[PDB]
Amino acid sequence: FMRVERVLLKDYTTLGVGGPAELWTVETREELKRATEAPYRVLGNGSNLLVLDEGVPERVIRLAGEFQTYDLKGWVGAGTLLPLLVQEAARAGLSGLEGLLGIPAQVGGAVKMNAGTRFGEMADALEAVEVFHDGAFHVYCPEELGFGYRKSHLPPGGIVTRVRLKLKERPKEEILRRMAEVDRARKGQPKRKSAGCAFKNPPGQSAGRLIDERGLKGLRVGDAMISLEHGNFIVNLGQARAKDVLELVRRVQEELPLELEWEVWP
Ligand SMILES: Cc1cc2nc3c(=O)[nH]c(=O)nc-3n(C[C@H](O)[C@H](O)[C@H](O)COP(=O)(O)OP(=O)(O)OC[C@H]3O[C@@H](n4cnc5c(N)ncnc54)[C@H](O)[C@@H]3O)c2cc1C
Ligand SMILES: C=C(O[C@H]1[C@H](O)[C@@H](CO)O[C@H](OP(=O)(O)OP(=O)(O)OC[C@H]2O[C@@H](n3ccc(=O)[nH]c3=O)[C@H](O)[C@@H]2O)[C@@H]1NC(C)=O)C(=O)O
């Protein structure tokens, strides 16, 4: 008896764009088994997604209920918000998540995208990962999941359902000091409607800095704009269409051989 309803994904992504989808809110292991009986996608916090104006035809699964419960010293549900865990770890005097401050991910999305900063990446903070695939749950170590930059290699159709974190006791004031350095490093970034960095960095470089140097900050298509604050942030000024965002992406790609970090749906 899980909740299934048609929604507009613009309401479920940090960028605030996206057409219609059938949303399945899964609260239990058995409900997950049912929801995955037909073609599906998994939605986390929608912070790395560019959803097109037509939306998607597959069941869109969100993990709630038991998947939002957590114990820092035990299992942590994949539907739990990473920003919550970052603060909870500091409160508990547990170190290991400080380098993940400022990433508005669900745990599952952070695993899929190996979310990280120069200070640490999600793969570093994992001891074990429960993954649902082929109708069953299995437990993996992070070394089995093919992690790289902004990358994982989960089993096909794999849904991350729960993790065990790799944390270490540290004085609370020291954890907070490490977090303050991450905050300082992120000062140049906007906190508006965005899906973070649109483009991946070429290995030697910052895509943001390259966009900046090419003078592309401030360029606009409808309500989609290359941020004046950070060149790699495309922001939604109100009612941008995905069409407008895509057009802006193509405008950048005409000038610079950059690849998207965003996942595009469909
Ligand atoms: C302001 C802002 C700042 C950001 N800063 C950073 C940063 O510093 N570093 C960084 O790496 N990223 C950053 N991001 C990008 C983004 O937060 C990450 O890619 C993050 O890991 C996405 O997680 P999510 O839960 O929002 O996933 P979503 O956007 O919902 O989904 C992304 C992908 O993960 C999949 N997915 C989601 N949940 C699961 C699951 N349970 N099991 C299997 N697959 C799943 C989706 O199907 C999709 O393929 C930022 C984004 C914003 C908006
Ligand atoms: C925000 C994301 O990740 C971010 C992550 O938060 C930060 C912190 O480690 O470093 C990466 O950005 P980045 O390479 O642009 O790092 P920043 O520190 O923001 O910028 C690097 C340098 O470029 C300069 N800067 C940045 C933007 C700009 O328009 N102009 C410019 O001159 C900054 O002043 C800084 O000296 C990540 N992007 C990738 C692809 O790795 C995301 O993935 O969505």
Cα-to-centroid distance, 162 and ligand 2 (Å):
29
> Token digits for 246?
């895509």
DSSP H or E segment with residue 253: helix 242-255
The resolution, in angstroms to one decimal, equals 1.6
User: Is there an atom of ligand 2 within 6 Å of 208 CB?
Assistant: yes
- Coil, helix or strand at residue 4: strand
- Coil, helix or strand at residue 234: strand
Query: What are the CA-CA distances from residue 46 to residues 49, 61, 75, 234, 245 (Å)?
Result: 5, 12, 23, 15, 16
Catalytically annotated residue among 59, 62, 164, 197? 197
DSSP code, position 212: H
The domain locations on the chain are 1-68, 69-189, 190-266
**Atom 36, ligand 1: residue with shortest CA distance:** 109
CATH architecture of structural domain 190-266: Alpha-Beta Complex (3.90)
Catalytically annotated residue among 41, 150, 170, 251? 150
> Token digits for 44?
């986390």
Numbers of helices and strands, H then E, in the chain: 6, 18
**Atom 6, ligand 2: residue with shortest CA distance:** 117
What is the CATH code for 69-189? 3.30.465.10
Burial of residue 210, with CB atoms counted within 10 A of its CB: 0-12 exposed, 13-18 middle, 19 or more buried: buried
Same fold, 1-68 and 190-266: no
Amino acid, single-letter form, for residue 198: A
Amino acid, single-letter form, for residue 68: Q
- CATH number assigned to the domain with residue range 1-68, chosen from the 4 options 3.40.50.300, 3.40.50.1390, 1.10.3720.10, 3.30.43.10: 3.30.43.10
> Token digits for 129?
């990962």
**Atom 9, ligand 2: residue with shortest CA distance:** 117
Task: Give yes or no for a contact between 25 and 240, defined as CB atoms under 8 angstroms apart.
Answer: no
Residue 6 falls in the annotated catalytic set: no
Of 15, 54, 95, 14, the residue nearest 265 (C-alpha): 54
What gap in Å lies between CA 55 and CA 79, rounded to an integer? 22
Q: Which atom belonging to ligand 2 lies closest to the Cα atom of 211?
A: 29
Of 77, 62, 58, 73, the residue nearest 13 (C-alpha): 62
What gap in Å lies between CA 144 and CA 123, rounded to an integer? 11
